[PDB]
Design an enzyme around this catalytic site. Sequence first.
Site, PDB file in Angstrom:
ATOM      1  N   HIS A  13     -11.123  -1.911  76.600  1.00  0.00           N
ATOM      2  CA  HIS A  13     -11.540  -3.297  77.183  1.00  0.00           C
ATOM      3  C   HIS A  13     -13.172  -3.496  77.169  1.00  0.00           C
ATOM      4  O   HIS A  13     -13.662  -2.508  78.002  1.00  0.00           O
ATOM      5  CB  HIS A  13     -10.755  -3.765  78.370  1.00  0.00           C
ATOM      6  N   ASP A  15     -15.234  -5.348  79.126  1.00  0.00           N
ATOM      7  CA  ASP A  15     -15.502  -5.505  80.379  1.00  0.00           C
ATOM      8  C   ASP A  15     -15.522  -4.234  80.963  1.00  0.00           C
ATOM      9  O   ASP A  15     -16.469  -3.903  81.874  1.00  0.00           O
ATOM     10  CB  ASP A  15     -14.382  -6.437  81.206  1.00  0.00           C
ATOM     11  N   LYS A  16     -14.540  -3.230  81.079  1.00  0.00           N
ATOM     12  CA  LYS A  16     -14.471  -2.109  81.107  1.00  0.00           C
ATOM     13  C   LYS A  16     -15.268  -0.996  80.346  1.00  0.00           C
ATOM     14  O   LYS A  16     -15.609   0.078  81.152  1.00  0.00           O
ATOM     15  CB  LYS A  16     -13.038  -1.417  80.984  1.00  0.00           C
ATOM     16  N   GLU A  41     -26.567  -2.494  85.181  1.00  0.00           N
ATOM     17  CA  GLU A  41     -25.609  -3.121  84.457  1.00  0.00           C
ATOM     18  C   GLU A  41     -25.534  -3.257  82.794  1.00  0.00           C
ATOM     19  O   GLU A  41     -26.718  -3.066  82.290  1.00  0.00           O
ATOM     20  CB  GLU A  41     -25.341  -4.531  84.916  1.00  0.00           C
ATOM     21  N   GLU A  54     -32.329  -1.788  86.680  1.00  0.00           N
ATOM     22  CA  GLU A  54     -33.262  -0.754  87.469  1.00  0.00           C
ATOM     23  C   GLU A  54     -32.972   0.417  87.664  1.00  0.00           C
ATOM     24  O   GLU A  54     -31.876   0.720  88.429  1.00  0.00           O
ATOM     25  CB  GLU A  54     -34.033  -1.590  88.390  1.00  0.00           C
ATOM     26  N   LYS A 154      -4.267  -3.769  77.050  1.00  0.00           N
ATOM     27  CA  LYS A 154      -3.902  -4.363  78.596  1.00  0.00           C
ATOM     28  C   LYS A 154      -2.592  -4.428  78.863  1.00  0.00           C
ATOM     29  O   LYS A 154      -1.649  -4.375  78.106  1.00  0.00           O
ATOM     30  CB  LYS A 154      -4.365  -5.933  78.249  1.00  0.00           C
ATOM     31  N   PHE A 223      -2.581  -8.437  66.930  1.00  0.00           N
ATOM     32  CA  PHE A 223      -3.903  -7.968  67.567  1.00  0.00           C
ATOM     33  C   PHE A 223      -4.548  -6.740  67.036  1.00  0.00           C
ATOM     34  O   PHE A 223      -4.331  -5.989  67.196  1.00  0.00           O
ATOM     35  CB  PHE A 223      -3.405  -7.624  69.178  1.00  0.00           C
ATOM     36  N   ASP A 231     -14.808 -11.239  71.918  1.00  0.00           N
ATOM     37  CA  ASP A 231     -14.812 -11.360  73.421  1.00  0.00           C
ATOM     38  C   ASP A 231     -16.227 -10.767  73.844  1.00  0.00           C
ATOM     39  O   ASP A 231     -16.858  -9.972  73.139  1.00  0.00           O
ATOM     40  CB  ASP A 231     -13.884 -10.385  74.093  1.00  0.00           C
ATOM     41  N   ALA A 232     -16.592 -11.392  75.078  1.00  0.00           N
ATOM     42  CA  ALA A 232     -17.758 -10.792  75.676  1.00  0.00           C
ATOM     43  C   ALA A 232     -17.487 -10.099  76.931  1.00  0.00           C
ATOM     44  O   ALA A 232     -16.447 -10.082  77.298  1.00  0.00           O
ATOM     45  CB  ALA A 232     -18.647 -12.107  76.160  1.00  0.00           C
ATOM     46  N   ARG A 237     -16.715  -6.754  86.004  1.00  0.00           N
ATOM     47  CA  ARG A 237     -16.018  -7.933  86.080  1.00  0.00           C
ATOM     48  C   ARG A 237     -14.577  -7.721  86.394  1.00  0.00           C
ATOM     49  O   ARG A 237     -13.593  -8.721  86.705  1.00  0.00           O
ATOM     50  CB  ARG A 237     -16.207  -8.469  84.794  1.00  0.00           C
ATOM     51  N   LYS A 238     -14.230  -6.381  86.243  1.00  0.00           N
ATOM     52  CA  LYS A 238     -12.732  -6.093  86.356  1.00  0.00           C
ATOM     53  C   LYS A 238     -12.688  -5.129  87.793  1.00  0.00           C
ATOM     54  O   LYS A 238     -12.148  -4.109  87.820  1.00  0.00           O
ATOM     55  CB  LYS A 238     -12.261  -5.085  85.147  1.00  0.00           C
ATOM     56  N   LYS A 258     -23.989   1.248  89.909  1.00  0.00           N
ATOM     57  CA  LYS A 258     -24.453   1.410  91.328  1.00  0.00           C
ATOM     58  C   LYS A 258     -24.214   2.988  91.766  1.00  0.00           C
ATOM     59  O   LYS A 258     -23.257   3.480  91.941  1.00  0.00           O
ATOM     60  CB  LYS A 258     -23.949   0.416  92.440  1.00  0.00           C
ATOM     61  N   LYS A 262     -25.829   2.421  97.632  1.00  0.00           N
ATOM     62  CA  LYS A 262     -25.412   0.922  97.723  1.00  0.00           C
ATOM     63  C   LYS A 262     -24.228   0.961  98.431  1.00  0.00           C
ATOM     64  O   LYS A 262     -23.025   1.390  98.215  1.00  0.00           O
ATOM     65  CB  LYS A 262     -25.341   0.445  96.096  1.00  0.00           C
ATOM     66  N   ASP A 264     -21.961  -1.140  98.809  1.00  0.00           N
ATOM     67  CA  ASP A 264     -20.870  -1.711  98.176  1.00  0.00           C
ATOM     68  C   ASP A 264     -19.956  -0.853  97.629  1.00  0.00           C
ATOM     69  O   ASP A 264     -18.870  -1.145  97.597  1.00  0.00           O
ATOM     70  CB  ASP A 264     -21.431  -2.905  96.830  1.00  0.00           C
TER      71      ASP A 264
END
Lengths: 379, 379, 379, 379
Positions: A13, A15-16, A41, A54, A154, A223, A231-232, A237-238, A258, A262, A264
């Site tokens: 995927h 995003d992944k 990122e 960075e 998915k 598929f 796809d972008a 995002r996941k 990260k 961080k 987060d």
Amino acid sequence: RFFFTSESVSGGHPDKMCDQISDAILDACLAQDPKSHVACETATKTGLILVLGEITTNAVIDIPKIVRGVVKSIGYDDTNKGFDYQTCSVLSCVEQQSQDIDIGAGDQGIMFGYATDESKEMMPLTHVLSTKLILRLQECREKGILPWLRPDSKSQVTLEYEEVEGHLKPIRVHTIVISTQHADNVSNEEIAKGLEEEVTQKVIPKELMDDKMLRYYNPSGRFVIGGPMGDAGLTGRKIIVDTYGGWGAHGGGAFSGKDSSKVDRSGAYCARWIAKSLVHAGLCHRVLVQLSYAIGVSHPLSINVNTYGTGICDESILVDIVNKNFDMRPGMIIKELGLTRPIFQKTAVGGHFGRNDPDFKWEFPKELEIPAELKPKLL
Amino acid sequence: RFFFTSESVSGGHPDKMCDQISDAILDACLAQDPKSHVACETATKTGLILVLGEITTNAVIDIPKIVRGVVKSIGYDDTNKGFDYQTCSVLSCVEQQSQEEDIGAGDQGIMFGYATDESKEMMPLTHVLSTKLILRLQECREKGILPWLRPDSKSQVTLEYEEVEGHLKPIRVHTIVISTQHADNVSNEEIAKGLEEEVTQKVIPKELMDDKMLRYYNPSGRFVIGGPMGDAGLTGRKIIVDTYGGWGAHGGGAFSGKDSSKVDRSGAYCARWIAKSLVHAGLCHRVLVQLSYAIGVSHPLSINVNTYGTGICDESILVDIVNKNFDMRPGMIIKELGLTRPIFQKTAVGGHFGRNDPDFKWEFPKELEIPAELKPKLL
Amino acid sequence: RFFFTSESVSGGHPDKMCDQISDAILDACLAQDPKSHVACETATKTGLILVLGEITTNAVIDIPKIVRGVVKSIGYDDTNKGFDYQTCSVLSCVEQQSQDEDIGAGDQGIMFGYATDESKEMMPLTHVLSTKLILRLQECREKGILPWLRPDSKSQVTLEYEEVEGHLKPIRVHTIVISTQHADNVSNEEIAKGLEEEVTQKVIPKELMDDKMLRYYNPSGRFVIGGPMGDAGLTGRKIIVDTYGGWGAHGGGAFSGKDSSKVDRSGAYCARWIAKSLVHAGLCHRVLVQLSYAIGVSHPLSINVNTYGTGICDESILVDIVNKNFDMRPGMIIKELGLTRPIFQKTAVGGHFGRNDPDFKWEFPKELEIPAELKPKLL
Amino acid sequence: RFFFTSESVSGGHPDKMCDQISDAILDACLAQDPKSHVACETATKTGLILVLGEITTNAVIDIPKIVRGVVKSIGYDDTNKGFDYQTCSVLSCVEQQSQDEDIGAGDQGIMFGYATDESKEMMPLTHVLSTKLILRLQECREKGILPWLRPDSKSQVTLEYEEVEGHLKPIRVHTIVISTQHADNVSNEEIAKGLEEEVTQKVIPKELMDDKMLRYYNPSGRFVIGGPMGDAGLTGRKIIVDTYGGWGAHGGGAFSGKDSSKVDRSGAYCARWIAKSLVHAGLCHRVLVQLSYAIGVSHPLSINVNTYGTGICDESILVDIVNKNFDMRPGMIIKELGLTRPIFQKTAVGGHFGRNDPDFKWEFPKELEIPAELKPKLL
């Protein structure tokens, strides 16, 4: 008695794929320089990978080569597959520094820890299955058990539940979804067969399995061509498949790319740790610890432990127990959980939690000093 | 009694700047072609905005010009401010095309609806304040009430609570955080003054306010140069500030940059709608509704309504009520909520929920057919 | 007697691929809006095409689709070939606008016109052959005469000469080079065979041909995986193959991607025109006209006609004749040569000069007023 | 007797800014690893620099930092100036590699050497002045002699000539052009005053100067800003200003960004060397030497010396004398001219030729074994 649904996605995927690539860079850095600082990122589209962010570090790194290596590993070696590690373009917009010549938190934020004794992994069964379902598609793809399979895939496991006064006992998997990419040289009928026989059956427990379970196998029809082509995809995002499948809560913090400085990430991890500990010590059946931090301020600005009425002692007490036994200063979290290590790439897929890899120092609970009033605690 | 924390960020925040820009494109499209399909994302870094994604539409759009216009509006007109709409670079990697209510859901996913009668907006007070705090910093910046102010800013409202058998009554704001960017022509002392006097006081209710309330004003020390310069920013990275501040749950679906055909948005919105309706109708004090969908399947694959024991009706009886009164087919959701309309840019900041803008057709509840057996419920 | 060498490259060459793509955009624009202003350039690398530049126009254009169409046309449909029009990435960084005779030269510059009666095309034989050599490789590739052939190719024709008091009479092709890309299914021996028989022989005149003529067929050994993969390519980097193969002079002005308002193109074209006329009228055997312009100044700042002692009239007279018969104001040059037309894509390969396409209004000479004192001149 | 025009541009010119940046990278490499191989190019637009190309080297280089340093050096501090080294974006698409006399030319090509005894520097006066004009604008900008000045600038010197027996004797500067960028805080009248007083007069010899000389000072009106903002710029696009101002010929080979293994550079340099030597030894007044190479072939595949009838013997001899005294194998050219050195950044502006910097080993002639029968030659 009720139903619930969770989902997961494969490392193919886009995003992944980003999440992975980003953490690949991080690992690459920590490898040479554990004191590295990485806030980077990845973004990917039709024929492209754009790494942006960075990094303060001494490590001499070959970013494009790392990137390509990750894409290859994931299986994208053919343009017909939708992506090619060998021929795709790599734009680096990362600003690198040398830095050459305890720890107020680096940013403000909110973070969540969750744990449920419904499963051995102390995780929501709904999420566990969903992700296991996906890991199996990998196994099958890589090991050749299902060679027609392709990386971009998915899944989705909606299952039935029952609550015994706060204790979650799952009954049966109500419905199931799985949408995988595949080679054109395969029959629609042949797909369903292989999917039921060699993935579903081999991952979903027979106890929860039924004649009565719904099945959704590539309901979008075909598929073949997929991946990042069309796809972008972006890092972080996941965020939900990365964690608890929407069972607990989230602070909004994307984990991947990260470094552990961080909050987060650290706070989110430490939070899991606490929770996992709190349910281990038999203090409760289900917890959702929330942590919160202030930029430039070392200590946690706030703290909350929400046991779902399941926890025997009571929350004013729990909140204390946590504080007594845990050092929630970001600086120390890194030390205690060994977050200076290069273990973060493998974290980027199949979820950050529920996995009992030795390096995941946040999945092995702590042993907590308890006031003698609550010495009678649980199973 | 317990404490909780939530957060929000300003439209100057790079992550949010993207969200905005992305939805700016969407609006631009729907303006000419309501049947447009837009699955587009933005990424930004030191001197650069990269728009990437895909969009099927008849609309003739000037993307770079839209982008620049959004950046300008946000206030980034000077390089010394950290960003300049006039001088920055705009890379477009968007693939543009030319191109019934039972349409299958164009994807699979999980979505959440939340509502709490603790506030007029049916939202968590903790989140409301946090975001209002931020909207006020805008007002101040734009209106000149505090000219030294700068766009990149962030807030955090941790507050004290009590629960009366499921009903949340907030008591007081325990602590407060606010980290804003500013001109170098300000005194650290001068900032604190203005912040307390012209934002905190003018937003935070006096009832919840006190002398023992903690204050964290730019604890990171100084913050003159900021914006997307130094930080990296992406679309859909502030998914939690966009929704319920971590109170309910999330499906992982980034809202911004996606057209309403994307179940991730529609389902999330419809979910809010349901919840907001469910407590209007006095059926409960607090609800969390979860929806779930399958790719290519029109009807919702699963459904769940978790009232926090606050619901008079009992649980399964109302999962029904929802089903009877709502058409949760994505196709209909668009029609009923008027999601073909260019209203999405303004959604991208200050949260998607809790705001009673007329165009936000999901914030005005529905009227539901109820079995007469339920005449005694709520105020 | 002496020797000389010139070179050319195919449209598959990345540098030239850019030139083409750039002029493809231009054409696309002029098609809808002849008064369009286009100053745009292309850059290509491994998996990527980056279009950057500026265009003022009313035309509604689909740049990425134009681009892809050009790459396809060139034959790059497979990643194994080194480039794939279908799968490659297209980044647009061009800033488009909506548009809000004796008119100002748009930029300052220096431009050159050349002509030699040694050939029918009024061009250096050395250059003509070199480029014809290449056009033939295209023919062979496209027409299937040599199916193993591939687009990225290059040539070089070094020729022996003699000068009869200024008149160039070529004697023989001393040496020859040709380096083409190819499929890996071809024998080294098989390549040489096909190259000699089906190109060299079918392009190089038998008069100039010999048994002693040197042959260099892929001396770099093998050349399977080429194209823009590995090699960076840019617009206007093959400025010499675009013109006279280093015979005359150059002003440094890249032709492709520039609209005809750019003196760099117009002046260069008009210069060719003048020269071609000057040798047609029997005023000389060989001419090199130089033009020069000032930014914002309509009329030419300077003028020079260097006949290589071959001119009957003497130079002072010539530069007068030129001035009398030609209006070298950029504004007029456009009108007279019909440079508002979409003819520029095809100009981007096989050289801008020497080709007698009807649309190339600069290759058809003028008829010049001449002082009656010299009605006796040349054939 | 006739007129001629040449031009030059400043290092602030985007096209030239690239040339510089590219050669900055090269230098950076050769510094650590002299055996480095660098074939890389720069492209720039608005607030963006894109470095793309390939480099085989052991050198550990910080590309973005080098880039920024070059932009700074050139003077772009302020986004106000049209470019800001501090705030602009840097995309690196360079593919870097570790590394695994008498070697084959790396690529095929054509190269030119030129020399004229009309000036001390053995260069066309028309070009020398044009470029000196520009170097002076730098001096003025940097030294504060004219603080209102700005980096992006351009010049053009068209001058009157006479040739007496092949010898070019310049008479007077017919017209002059100069278009510079500037601060908004200065008048058009004030600008004219300065350029005339502190640049024109201080560079143009008074012998060639007069009252009838034309002057074109920012005829495009105003030019407050500029730079790469609103123009696009690429490496190797100012190939003529880099060399002989269109006096001789060109092979099409962009010099900058290419290491010395690239025949395009080496051959061009060696060619200059030869020419400079040939006119020093009194063999002629004016020469244009052309070299030519085949890919993979070490020795030059062709050679030509065009003296403009101003040489003292046949031209077949000259061709011999060259061959006897020079080793034109690329491998040797590197050794003899010391082209493994980091001297290439400074070559990137004010022309590659005519400058008598010690490191420019191609500007100091050789001593040639000429026959004894030609002991009587030239002054």
